Amino acid sequence: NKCVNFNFNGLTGTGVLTESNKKFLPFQQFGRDIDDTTDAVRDPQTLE
Amino acid sequence: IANQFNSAIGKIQDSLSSTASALGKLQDVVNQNAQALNTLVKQLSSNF
Amino acid sequence: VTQKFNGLTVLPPLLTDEMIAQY
């Protein structure tokens, strides 16, 4: 809920991080939008 | 003359309700601006 | 008739749809 310089598995980005309702399947680490950019991510330590 | 005007306005309600085609000249302008923006955003995915 | 990382923004028109209905 704060704007941050995030780096998850080397996916260096910037933005506000928020709890998603997106139901990823087990094999997926990153989610993308229509715009072909990463708009959701699985945290690698606690899998939310 | 009043009854013909009142009837003709009654057909304007029916026409604008009955067909999605009626406002096509406006919807074409919304669609072209949406297409031009959606294309501009997809060029961010391109490698060059 | 029918924010994002791209850096786009749609500004609102100076006259609202109520103001156009009033004119």
Chain C interface with B: residues with Cβ < 8 Å = 1-2, 4, 6, 8
Q: Give me A45's structure tokens.
A: 């330590």
Q: How many other C-beta atoms are found inside a 10 Å radius of the C-beta of residue B24?
A: 12
Q: From CA A37, how far away is CA B20, in angstroms rounded? A: 34
Q: From CA A11, how far away is CA A16, in angstroms rounded? A: 15
Measured in angstroms, the resolution is: 3.2
Q: From CA B35, how far away is CA B43, in angstroms rounded? A: 12
Q: From CA A40, how far away is CA C2, in angstroms rounded? A: 28
The β-bridge partners of A7 are: A12
Q: Would you call C1 and B30 a contact, using CB atoms and an 8 Å cutoff? A: yes
Locus of tokens 């923006």: B37
Q: From CA A8, how far away is CA B48, in angstroms rounded? A: 26
Q: From CA A11, how far away is CA A30, in angstroms rounded? A: 9
Q: Give me A2's structure tokens.
A: 């704060």
Q: Which among A15, C7, A12 is positioned nearest to A4, based on CA atoms?
A: A15
Q: What share of chain B is helix, strand, coil (3-state, %, to 5)?
A: 85, 0, 15
